[PDB]
Amino acid sequence: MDALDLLLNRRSASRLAEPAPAGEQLENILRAGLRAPDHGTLQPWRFFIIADDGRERFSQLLEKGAREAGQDEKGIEKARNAPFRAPLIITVVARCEDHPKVPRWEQEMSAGCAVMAMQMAALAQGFNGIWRSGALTESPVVRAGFECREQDKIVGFLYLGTPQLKASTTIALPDTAPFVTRF
Amino acid sequence: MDALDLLLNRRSASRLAEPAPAGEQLENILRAGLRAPDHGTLQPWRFFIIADDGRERFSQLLEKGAREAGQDEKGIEKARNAPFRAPLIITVVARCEDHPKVPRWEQEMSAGCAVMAMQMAALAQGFNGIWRSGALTESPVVRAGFECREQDKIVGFLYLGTPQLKASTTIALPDTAPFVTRF
């Protein structure tokens, strides 16, 4: 698939089903994430692959975080069900470090860019995904399940799989005037 | 190029010269930025196109930022000279709004993803770019020059142009195992 076409028409997909990207297709997704722009080459990322019984362990972790947060019954139920919306989830942690020339937000930003690169590498291979976050990225229970230190941050849960719908190509390209200024 | 190839091999380039992307090719870069993932469709981005006399204006702005902060003459001179490292610069501001379901960091990451998408769109079309930031993204006078409110943030100065260095050997893709855990 053509690179410019992907960038101009990049779309996510929330309706995701088996098969998940696997083997070398999954490795391609992970390597795209590891090519994110990275001030100082700190490689400030850690990825967690959630699939098979990992999805159940993820469900239990989110439930516990929802209860620990004091969410209501609907919130706990949504957390329990959240992992089963895709066959594969990749949690991306910004693994940050004290550095003179690289503020923490730029390392967090690099990890965020890894999420989007990973979604586009799925899309490039006939899969798709959606970057999700929600309040439980800040849950102490959930942060501990992904080995976060105090200075680390969960920047996304990237749900991945085979979309029900081929990525639309009929929609027209975005327009620019509200957003672009000559300096 | 092929999309998966661009993502797996994505490289920035610091040594850039004329010709800058222009016309349709520049508009394609801007449309790619506007396809960034965006929680809640807040569209939380403003882009500033910096070229020709705008590059000189940008130079004076950065120079003033360094001077007001008390930098020495070498820091002031380096700020003054910074914009002339590329024929075209796109400043990206995260234009953030308070939404209970969309924390400000997610809006900032959408704007950061727009920078990367824009660099990839240059690369896809035979140009390239480098995402730069540095300490003067926080300078009050620089932020005012880009119309930042208190809740807004400069997330990058994207330097753009035609690569000057010869195309080098394709670099090895990274091993995924040190960064990846099965949850």
Ligand SMILES: Cc1cc2nc3c(=O)[nH]c(=O)nc-3n(C[C@H](O)[C@H](O)[C@H](O)COP(=O)(O)O)c2cc1C
């Ligand atoms: C940091 C970040 C967090 C996001 N979190 C969510 C989320 O929790 N739920 C959701 O529906 N979309 C979320 N989004 C937006 C989706 O990833 C996606 O962009 C949205 O569904 C629009 O679809 P599109 O990407 O095809 O334009 C988030 C985006 C970003 C950049």
Ligand SMILES: Cc1cc2nc3c(=O)[nH]c(=O)nc-3n(C[C@H](O)[C@H](O)[C@H](O)COP(=O)(O)O)c2cc1C
């Ligand atoms: C948010 C952000 C800000 C950055 N700022 C700078 C910068 O000011 N100077 C610089 O040399 N690299 C900066 N980088 C890293 C470069 O854009 C680029 O990734 C780096 O030169 C490595 O080259 P590569 O992208 O080909 O791997 C930044 C990266 C990010 C994500």
